[PDB]
Each structure stands twice: as C-alpha cells, then as structure tokens.
C-alpha cells in the first residue's frame, strides 16, 4: 500500500529471481586467472607484441561519437592494396585484416 508521498516503484522481483543469482566471489580469482593467461601468452609469443596485431584507425559510427576515433577490427583490403601488403602475408607478419570493411572517404 502507498504511504504518503513517494515514488511509484516497480520491482522486477515477481519471477522467482533467487534461483538465478550470479554472485561475484570468484571475481578476484577470475582476474588472477586472466592475468596468468596473459602472461603465459606473452611468454609463448616471445618477441611478438603481447597485445597482438596492429589495429586500424577507425571513426566511431553515430552522431554521438563521430568526433572520436578508436581502434578497428582489421585493415581493409583497399588499405593493404595501396600499401603494398598481401592480404595473406599481413596476418603472418602481424597485421589484422578486415575483408568486410570498406573505405568511403
């Protein structure tokens, strides 16, 4: 029952939520495991960069973010073609390629 002034609240707890509750007590353990995996991978690829392939410069899509620029998935085939790198050798020498990305400008 409502009592004096207040906000009309609509809790989404009508659907037996206690069978599906995700606790996070394994979050520090997960961070430790991820760090160990990162270090093991870096040791495995010894002189190669730890983060992986170089990524292209990519402008963010919508009108909210088009002033910002970030890293993309891979270099486009047009970029590789005019840079003189084979699209099958780029991945071997550590260049990410994105065959489905186009260059509008």
């Amino acid at each position: 029952a409502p009592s004096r002034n207040g906000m009309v609240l609509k809790p989404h707890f009508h659907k037996d939520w206690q069978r599906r509750v995700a606790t996070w007590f394994n979050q520090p353990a997960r961070k430790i495991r991820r760090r160990k995996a990162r270090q093991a991978k870096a040791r495995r690829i010894a002189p190669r960069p730890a983060s992986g392939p170089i990524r292209p410069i990519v402008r963010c899509p919508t009108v909210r973010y088009h002033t910002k620029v970030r890293a993309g998935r891979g270099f486009s085939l047009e970029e590789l073609r005019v840079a003189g790198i084979h699209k099958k050798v780029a991945r071997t020498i550590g260049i990410s390629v994105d065959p489905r990305r186009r260059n509008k400008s």
């Binding site: 190669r48 099958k88 991945r91 550590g94």
Partner: protein, 122 residues
Amino acid sequence: AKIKARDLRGKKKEELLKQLDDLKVELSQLRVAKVTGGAASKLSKIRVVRKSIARVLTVINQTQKENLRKFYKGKKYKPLDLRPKKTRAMRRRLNKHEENLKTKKQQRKERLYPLRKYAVKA
C-alpha cells in the same frame, strides 16, 4: 617354507600344474582338519595355502597371457582382451595419423604463408 612368485617363473607348465594340484590337495586336507577340529597351526596354514594357490595361478595366467601377446604381436586383428582398454571414448577417437594429416589446400597454405617471428620497435 613359503613359495615365491620369482622362482615359479622359470618353471614350465607341467610342474606348475603339478604344484598347483599338490597345493589344492593340501588345502582340502586342511579343510577336513578344520571341520574335524584339528589344530590352530593347521587352521592358520589355510590362508598360507590359499595364497600359494593364488600365486601359482597368477604366474600361470601371466605366462599364458604374455605368450599370447607375443603370438599376436604384429597381427592385423587381435583378441579384444589383448587390445588396449583405455576408455570407450578414447578407443572411438581418431588415431594420430588421421588426426594430424591435412588437406593439400591446407598444407599449401602453410607452405606459402607461414607464421613469422617478428618484433615491433616502440
């Protein structure tokens, strides 16, 4: 004066069976003594004779099994009890050769564009 498994391995089939039969006869006599009262020493000898029978039988079985393994070594088809018994799934899975063989397209890719060792200056 027990019998050991080490000195039984040199013997051949006939005297192994003979000694097994002697042990079985002695065990039956010990059971007769047990049901007719007998003595504590004769009661305690029952376990000794039983373990000696087990020893002789396991030596016989191991010798027969290794002879069968030698006979069936190098044959295309072997009895199931001689084939390895890893695990049902492990026996179903692919062997090494068909696990690691590749297509001509795949090995052409590996030959033409192999992974390179490289470093990037900062």
